[PDB]
């Protein structure tokens with residue numbers, strides 16, 4: 001379905017002047033803006049789905065009207081903030097679709113009196129973090145480490161980061177927000193009601209409508225926090241020992257502490273990158289690990305004291321705090337597919353050993369280990385759609401990324417990742433095998449919203465990944481879905497089905 005004169009005239013009429021139409025060209029602005037926020041080259045392929053038009057609204061009413069104009073046609077709506085969807089569900093779709101890029105909605109309004117902020121859904125974590133440190137040295141916010149990840153889909157799915165052990169997810173700290181429904185109705189928390197305002201805070205993106213802006217509570221942070229990023233080159237024996245003890249240390253640390261691990265291997269050596277964050281000074285930080293985790297062999301020089309801003313930039317591997325404010329800094333430029341696990345029981349050494357052995361078989365693979373507990377276990381499972389709280393111990397994350405040179409090995413890389421996930425099945429959560437909506441996994445299945453045979457059973461088919469992402473909260477998400485989008489205008493392969 002083309003993007004005809006009706007759609008365009010509708011946009012022109014409504015003052016939404018920033019938009020381009022599909023172009024087979026490569027030198028075109030369309031293709032440029034399209035590939036501008038494709039954060040997973042896995043989907044840069046010339047055979048993937050491409051929008052009939054890309055619209056870049058610059059205000060909440062332009063956003064409202066954009067949705068209104070698209071509703072006059074049959075197009076599927078696709079919202080994009082940072083475009084970091086692991087499945088590229090913000091710039092792809094089986095059916096002809098319109099791409100609503102929210103990058104022009106990147107304003108952060110910080111209020112130092114209430115210590116809250118109105119973050120436009122276009123604003124990325126980085127641009128947000130920058131705004132906060134630009135305004136205060138005693139304020140921060142909890143969310144992912146990826147500075148290019150947009151708050152649009154990030155906070156919509158939850159938002160887990162290095163401070164979540166201290167403050168919970170991003171969505172755990174949303175006090176208000178502006179959602180724009182299928183009719184372009186501009187709704188605040190009071191207008192949308194509690195069932196929906198609850199849903200949008202971890203229920204997923206591209207499901208409830210277009211978040212125009214988030215109102216977050218800004219969080220206290222000492223003017224000096226401590227972090228370390230130390231890569232240990234060890235053998236598999238030591239690596240297992242370190243990982244096996246890590247899970248306990250990491251999960252049982254005080255909320256003022258976060259210890260995350262990035263593991264990979266290559267035949268000979270196993271490399272474990274230790275990412276440390278302390279909600280306080282260096283001496284206390286080092287004292288703690290010197291006691292709890294002396295095996296890391298971390299030294300004084302390893303611990304860096306810096307502002308909270310400097311720390312989230314440092315942790316993200318950025319050169320400077322200014323780079324937090326750069327939304328177009330690709331952090332790898334490599335295609336990838338990532339599966340995640342959540343643990344209820346501790347993991348046997350054999351699990352880390354197996355993981356490390358499997359890793360040593362494929363250098364392009366690597367695991368990310370995150371501890372829960374602390375503040376994550378104090379927030380109710382039903383406080384927000386994100387269920388995994390008290391009881392959840394670790395977030396294990398299996399990634400595999402490659403170069404354009406290695407595009408041929410594609411299927412092989414995915415094969416490895418499939419083998420690793422299968423290998424971990426006994427050691428992780430079961431019935432259901434839990435997942436995280438911001439780590440959306442189309443392998444868990446999907447829904448063909450064009451197939452009425454399936455659409456009639458959308459809720460049960462969706463159960464597979466639904467209870468996996470949201471567990472018991474899945475029920476309330478369906479009531480909330482029916483209230484704000486019964487027509488299922490906002491959908492994607494793993495969107496919450498409305499009651500029909």
Ligand SMILES: *[C@@H]1O[C@H](CO)[C@@H](O[C@@H]2O[C@H](CO)[C@@H](O[C@@H]3O[C@H](CO)[C@@H](O)[C@H](O[C@H]4O[C@H](CO)[C@@H](O)[C@H](O)[C@@H]4O[C@H]4O[C@H](CO)[C@@H](O)[C@H](O)[C@@H]4O[C@H]4O[C@H](CO)[C@@H](O)[C@H](O)[C@@H]4O)[C@@H]3O)[C@H](O)[C@H]2NC(C)=O)[C@H](O)[C@H]1NC(C)=O
Pocket residue numbers: 017018019036056103104
């Ligand atoms: C649809 O949405 C898309 C996405 O948002 C829009 O595309 C964006 O369009 C932006 C402009 O509208 C564009 O910003 C540009 O970014 C470049 C860097 O790539 C930047 O250099 C440009 O900024 C200059 O120009 C603007 C005005 O055009 C000035 O306000 C600004 O101060 C900059 O001018 C200064 O630097 C220039 C060289 O960098 C000098 O030539 C100029 O003289 C001036 O220098 C003075 O100021 C300096 C610093 O203050 C000082 O050192 C010096 O001595 C002088 O005093 C430009 O803004 C984005 O690149 C683009 N974004 C993307 C992702 O493509 C698009 O516009 C929308 N479409 C529609 C229809 O609206």
Ligand SMILES: *Cc1cc2c(nc3c(=O)[nH]c(=O)nc-3n2C[C@H](O)[C@H](O)[C@H](O)COP(=O)(O)OP(=O)(O)OC[C@H]2O[C@@H](n3cnc4c(N)ncnc43)[C@H](O)[C@@H]2O)c(*)c1C
Pocket residue numbers: 039078079080081082083084085086088089090091102121122143144145146148149150151152153154155156157159160161204205206207209210211212331438439492
């Ligand atoms: C690329 C990348 C992803 C990361 C990174 N680090 C993460 C981390 O530290 N913790 C995590 O929890 N997740 C991490 N991820 C994955 C991201 O969390 C997810 O990819 C988030 O969805 C990020 O959102 P965004 O960058 O905006 O991706 P989009 O593709 O634009 O959107 C995702 C999803 O949400 C819908 N959507 C977008 N915008 C809106 C608005 N404003 N309103 C409602 N819904 C919206 C889209 O349709 C899409 O379906 C580290 C890196 C490098």
Ligand SMILES: COc1ccc(C[C@H]2c3cc(O)c(OC)cc3CCN2C)cc1O
Pocket residue numbers: 145146260261262275331332333334335336338368369370397399401
């Ligand atoms: C501190 O905790 C973590 C640290 C790093 C990661 C991996 C990171 C990533 C880093 C890459 O370089 C990359 O290459 C394509 C892909 C990805 C996919 C997931 N993304 C989030 C996950 C974590 O949970």
Ligand SMILES: *[C@@H]1O[C@H](CO)[C@@H](O)[C@H](O)[C@H]1NC(C)=O
Pocket residue numbers: 450451452453454
């Ligand atoms: C509709 O869904 C069912 C179940 O997946 C499938 O068997 C059938 O082929 C689908 N029909 C269409 C329209 O493709």
